[PDB]
Design a protein around this ligand. Structure first.
Ligand code: CA
Ligand code: CA
Ligand code: CA
Ligand code: CA
Ligand code: CA
Length: 377
């Protein structure tokens, strides 16, 4: 209790917190700790709720005033640790790195080509030295972007005509396959693809130039609306991957639509013109742009936008795709891997307010590209 000779005497828990109501301080002094009193201040007024062993699944029970706190282990949640944590591809992507699938209320993790599923069933071990998608004041026409470093952009390639002039980009998918836009085929009759390019005016020894052997455009290409604007090139010489030459991983359609396209930002690399009606960039450059919602995308476009196109970029910043990057990939940087989700299609002006770069959707065409990699392979 609170008295004038009681507290005057050194407080004892056996002489205050027992016969008396054990209100406080006499509930703390003798204990001289907030890590022992608070645990004794709830076992004298409302009782210890942990005497019933409520926290199941070997959880920890801590006593509080009016309730108890349960400590549950990994995969256990709920008020009293009675529930297993339901794993879904919506919540933390089902812990899968590349491919998450839902079967019988269970999460199955699978890895793309060049990766093996780990022993624990969650991680993806690369199967080779250079797997896909794995990296190893500036005025005067710079659209918010940075310069591509060595090993940072190895999946980009440039197409040059007979005069060695760059006109379109390309994404390396394998030792033989380059992905670009269909209209790039109409720009030049014959062209060569250079991979590992860092500067068109300087050969640094890492650029490999290949002739194009097989050309496959989309059959449903339309000139009026630029629809189905995608092309596949099979090169005459094999691509030997190295420091500055690496492929990119092709994701799954449903996973790309549910998780990859919900990422806030993506990356597009290219050699194209630095600004509208301007000179071509001497060196490879990349730009990070966010996804644009479909309603404003269709409201801001004077032309028809189908299910195979989407808007990306900034409404206010001077940052958007421009001509010369046609056929360049739009890639999203997931936890440890780059995944292709789009391909540059076009853009009404460059760095223009109220306009967004239109990118061709890879997901609706992946099934076709697979055929293009086995129909003539
Ligand atoms: Ca005391
Ligand atoms: Ca006391
Ligand atoms: Ca006693
Ligand atoms: Ca006492
Ligand atoms: Ca007494």
């Amino acid at each position: 209790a609170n008295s004038f000779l009681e507290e005057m005497k050194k407080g004892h828990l056996e002489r205050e917190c027992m016969e008396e109501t054990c209100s406080y301080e006499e509930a703390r002094e003798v204990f001289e700790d907030s890590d022992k009193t608070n645990e004794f201040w709830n076992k004298y007024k409302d009782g210890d709720q942990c005497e019933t062993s409520p926290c199941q699944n070997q959880g920890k029970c801590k006593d509080g005033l009016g309730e108890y706190t349960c400590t549950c282990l990994e995969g256990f949640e709920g008020k009293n640790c009675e529930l297993f944590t339901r794993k879904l591809c919506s919540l933390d992507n089902g812990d899968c790195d590349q491919f998450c699938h839902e079967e019988q209320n269970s999460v199955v993790c699978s890895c793309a080509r060049g990766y093996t599923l780990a022993d624990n069933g969650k991680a993806c071990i690369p199967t080779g030295p250079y797997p896909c998608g794995k990296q190893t004041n500036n005025l005067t026409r710079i659209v918010g972007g940075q310069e591509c470093k060595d090993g940072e952009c190895p999946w980009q390639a440039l197409l040059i005509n007979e005069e060695n002039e760059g006109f379109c980009g390309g994404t390396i998918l394998s030792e033989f396959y380059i992905l670009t836009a269909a209209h790039c085929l109409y720009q030049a009759k014959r062209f060569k693809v250079r991979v590992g390019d860092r500067n068109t005016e300087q050969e640094e020894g890492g650029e490999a130039v290949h002739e194009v052997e097989v050309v496959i455009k989309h059959n449903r290409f339309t000139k009026e609306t630029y629809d189905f604007d995608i092309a596949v090139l099979r090169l005459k010489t094999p691509i030997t991957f190295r420091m500055n030459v690496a492929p990119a991983c092709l994701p799954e359609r449903d996973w790309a639509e549910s998780t990859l396209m919900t990422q806030k930002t993506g990356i597009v690399s290219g050699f194209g013109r630095t600004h509208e009606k301007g000179r071509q960039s001497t060196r490879l450059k990349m730009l990070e742009v966010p996804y644009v919602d479909r309603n404003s995308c269709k409201l801001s476009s004077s032309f028809i936008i189908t299910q195979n196109m989407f808007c990306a970029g900034y409404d206010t910043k001077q940052e958007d795709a421009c001509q010369g990057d046609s056929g360049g990939p739009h890639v999203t940087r997931f936890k440890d891997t780059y995944f292709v989700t789009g391909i540059v299609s076009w853009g009404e002006g460059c760095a223009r307010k109220g306009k967004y770069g239109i990118y061709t959707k890879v997901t609706a065409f992946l099934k076709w590209i697979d055929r293009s990699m086995k129909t003539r392979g």
